[model samples]
Target: EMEKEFEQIDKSGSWAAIYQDIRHEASDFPSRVAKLPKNKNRNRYRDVSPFDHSRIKLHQEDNDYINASLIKMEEAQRSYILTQGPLPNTVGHFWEMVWEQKSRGVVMLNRVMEKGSLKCAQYWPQKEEKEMIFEDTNLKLTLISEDIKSYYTVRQLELENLTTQETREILHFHYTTWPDFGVPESPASFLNFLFCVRESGSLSPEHGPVVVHCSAGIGRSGTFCLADTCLLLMDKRKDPSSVDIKKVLLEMRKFRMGLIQTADQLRFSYLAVIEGAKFIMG
Candidate 1:
């Protein structure tokens, strides 16, 4: 099988070799670290996050018995989910994290980083550099493309090979494509990357959910969610279920409240799915 042979070899090896070649090309990824902003104080309040799932719950909303309880801690592992935002530092004091994908059926995105936000506007490769950290993850951990967009702050940087030190791809993110506010170029890029991950056999429990974040972790995250939903629906030969979308949005809100907070973001999914000439979400 040509497909089998293809999967056996790492396509990203070229990426890796390329990474090694350009490891030190950039001066550093641009990042600004500030104390948690006073305006963001409200959102910073710490309740039990999915990271702290010891107090899971089972809610009975009317006849719908929803079990939103945290999975057992020992049973739990790392993850990364694609999320749009309540945005980490953008809101008021005691600010809550901008995004949460708690109810989106735990996937690769949530588990990748054992620490802070998915991305930040920081420098790279050097000690404490944002690019260095992300690069290290690319080597040490599995890198699943989330394809989510962002309103979150971001810095652009390129990588040179780690071994040979050469430049690779140019990448960055900002709050440019807010689902509710900002516009986007390729709305399906995130989930399509997810589809690539699935087809490529890059997704695994050992790695966790395909981490995704766009500004505030909602719009692009929601956009990815829409595609994933469409993928599942198409696979099952069913229509997009309203209940599924509600459940996903609800869980996303629980992690980071006010994610997907606009009609446009929600409505965009319908538009995107219907416009697909050939569904490739699986």
Candidate 2:
């Protein structure tokens, strides 16, 4: 809650003065909202806090706490498994990381790659050329076919790498994007893939904790992960408390500093769940 106690005074020209005047009009709404476009009234109350409880998490990429936190999953039969740490430098680097992690336990790499030792990265390669950095570091880098529309999934990912002798899904990723940049053509499809995995009854930290990462592990990875996790907890009526934001972000910030940087993003994150709150309640 903002400390709203503005004294009636100068309305000469300052916008801050005007903002303070009407701060209380929507202070008590059930949800939070974000900065509407400039044309819209600036002070419409938006429920931004994602969590019903008081926990807030700050994330860091280099840190291992994200996976570590998942280790705290309470299902008795459910167990936490080790996944690959952040990809070191390149896809080759990812191989080393994966080898090390798989040796320790199963690790999940965030993206998908066509060539290299570990090859289980997700492929959404339409806009990859313009949006991705396809460097040829002796990895036989090949861009995705332009004609392809929908994202290539685990089934296709499995097809890319072939070895008749010993078969193990390699762990490495190609960081690429789909042609549809600003608006993902099928966000729902992507969402469904993740949800199916979650409900498949076969996932656990042991096999891997679904190591979700992006360049910064902030934007796409973060949002996708937050969507899946929060939605799951909401479905169970056990959404991680708002208080967990601090705990979660504290662990994340261990690796990458200043994660979840902006206040507006945080507010919107909370709002995403609130939009679905009525569904969860039912």
Candidate 3:
């Protein structure tokens, strides 16, 4: 059945068109993001920008749209801020958003450097010997511990509000094997990584939605969210067959544009969903 499903995804070419349709719909959505002066610096590149209607707004002063969008599923009580990697100039604002949102963890699906390109800024402190102090946001970040897995790295981050002298622990889950503009090598590896994040209990409703990101925050990030949400539904309803993958993807696209970037990504998402449902049911 799964093999036939994969064949169907290719034969219909529907995922490709659905991707385009999402982009087309997003093009017409209202946006004040482009009008902001800080827009240019918030993006790592010109081509990667956030949709105006869904982008996360900085409540601090006179700044907004750091190429970030809030994706929430109220029924499941899951929320995630899907945003592009932080540019050098936007690192402080990125941490500011984290602080303001009270996010307990960040799910980084991309590396700081990929294919000889600086895909994301080193937003967190690199070593335990040093701490990252963002003067602009008056926050200090320190590396509490580091765990290097076979395919991913988990780090314990301490975020301190300098003014109030309050501290919070943030988990950083970095998947190291995913390639640029490509899916993971295998669904097993990806699911293993996903469960590691789930085991931490960071994605629970008690904490803020985990901030998920890749280079663009829509492609790989979207894949992660779609798979997780579908699995959550399957587990909650106790029926894997009840979930509609296409319908869920369309609903998620309404929150953030250009999700599931390629047909291959969409196919992999289904594979992940099936495998994840098996894991849940058993």
Best by lDDT: 3
Ordered list by TM-score, greatest first = 3, 2, 1
Which candidate number maximizes TM-score?
3
Per-residue lDDT, model 3, residue 233, is 78
Candidate 1 wrongly placed segments (more than 4 Å): 1-119, 123-181, 185-191, 200-206, 237-244, 251-255, 276-278
Q: Total backbone clashes of model 1?
A: 79
Each model's C-alpha lDDT?
0.32, 0.31, 0.79
What are the per-residue Cα lDDT tens digits for candidate 1 across 1-282?
A: 122222232343342342232232211211111112432331222321222222111121221111111211111222334332222332110011101211212222221122444432222222223333223212111122323434322222343334344333322232332332333444455344445444533233433243344433444454554445444544454443322444444444434333342444444444445444245542
> Model 3, residue 20: displacement in angstroms?
4.1
Q: By TM-score, how accurate is candidate 3?
A: 0.91
Write one digit per residue (lDDT tens) for candidate 3, span 1-282: 344666676688776775565556544455467546657666765665566777787767666557787787765567888888888888888887887888888989889999898988999998998999999778999999999998899999999989898899999999888866567656887888788888988788778778889888888888889888888877776555767776777777777777777767877898888887777656
Error of 3 at 8 (Å): 2.0
Candidate 1 at residue 175, lDDT? 32
Winner on TM-score (1 vs 2): 2
The deviation in Å at residue 53 for candidate 1 is 4.3
Clashes of each: 79, 43, 0
Q: lDDT score of model 3?
A: 0.79
Better of 2 and 3 by lDDT: 3
